[PDB]
Amino acid sequence: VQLVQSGAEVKKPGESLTISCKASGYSFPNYWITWVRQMSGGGLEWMGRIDPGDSYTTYNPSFQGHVTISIDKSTNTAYLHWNSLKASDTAMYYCARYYVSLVDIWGQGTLVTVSSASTKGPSVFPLAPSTAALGCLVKDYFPEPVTVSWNSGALTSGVHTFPAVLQSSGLYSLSSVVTVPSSSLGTQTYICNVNHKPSNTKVDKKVEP
Amino acid sequence: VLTQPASVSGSPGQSITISCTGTSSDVGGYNYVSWYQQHPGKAPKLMIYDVNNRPSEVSNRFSGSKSGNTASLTISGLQAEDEADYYCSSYTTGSRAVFGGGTKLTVLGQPKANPTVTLFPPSSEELQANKATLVCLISDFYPGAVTVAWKADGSPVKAGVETTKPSKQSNNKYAASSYLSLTPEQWKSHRSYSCQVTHEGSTVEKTVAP
């Protein structure tokens, strides 16, 4: 039983937005589908529930008229739709199976960032060895997130991608450090793969002394 | 919103209790009270349902109680892994549902750990673009409070400093970052720059030089 949610979304206030939730592994018309919102640093907020047998919905009054929950019984899909987004809608949204009184199965969550600021792609610089610690500075990007891999996924040990800093410019910086034997520095290539989906940025930098 | 304490703490082996006070349209009109555990970067996991019922994947250390419009979640043999956020849910009149504000459970026995500081100077690729940035990476510290100070030749640097709030790692220790943005001329003028990290009264310094 999986509830697969749609990808992350970077939008601007006033734009429409539809996020989806595909259910699989059970009889869809027999369980309710609920939507739960959680802001960054905040708590869980119930938004509404829908019965996919007859599309009957119930909403939290604070969200009624601002968002719409809908169902597609032919495709086992649940939809959450905004006609006009607000910056206060920036949050993570989970779809979840609701059975009588509990919430048993959750989705992975869809991150929705609503900002009038511009998507900016990062600048990648190598933090060179001077055990040794190599790294990569990911500088000036919006919005979050950035993902950093080393060696196309082969270097997973010693990898610490430190958390990002929101700078005064309104942009973010991040640093990823891999600790390596100081004897491989001359015999082993170390490449940082920086991926920033909001800007469609994908860069690879080789870190050399 | 159901009312929960903002924070609750305890020691390993001890038994802690989290309250959840609602009205009679939620906790006091139904026996449908659910308890959820959420770890950072994870979705919530059902811990207790129907007031006292417990699912099969939950240790018997987790019990539920209801007393009027107040519900209660008890955790008996405290482990470090129990440190998370705990949310109560209730079924409300009109086929609605309601969540609580959240309780941060803290396990109060973790051992003091000193921070490791790694300081990276600006890269040539960045100085070529007429930019300079020094990077201080602070790792493996507990508790999660640090002070960062930058010095150029011993003199306190005032501007260009951007520091993160401490954040928990996989080892239950804390990590932080400090970035000092400089122009290439400032970077090439001073003999040395230092990042000083103060934690629990002790200061650890790292230095770089062009």
Numbering used by the authors:
A (entry chain H): 2 to 131, 139 to 217
B (entry chain L): 3 to 212
What does the report in the manuscript say about this coordinate set?
Whereas traditional therapeutic antibodies have been limited to extracellular antigens, T cell receptor mimic (TCRm) antibodies can target intracellular antigens presented by cell surface major histocompatibility complex (MHC) proteins. We previously engineered and described a TCRm that detects an HLA-A*02-presented peptide derived from alpha fetoprotein (AFP). AFP is a biomarker for hepatocellular carcinoma (HCC), the fourth leading cause of global cancer deaths with a mortality rate of almost 100%14.
We also determined the crystallographic structures of the unbound TCRm and AFP/HLA-A*02 complex. Although the resolutions of these structures were lower than that of the complex, electron density was clear enough to show that, in contrast with many TCR-pMHC interactions, there were no large conformational changes seen in either molecule outside of changes in side chain rotamers, small rigid body shifts of the TCRm variable domains, and slight remodeling of CDR1H. The rigid interaction between TCRm and AFP/HLA-A*02 likely further contributes to high specificity and affinity, as more flexible interactions between TCRs and their ligands have been associated with higher degrees of cross-reactivity.
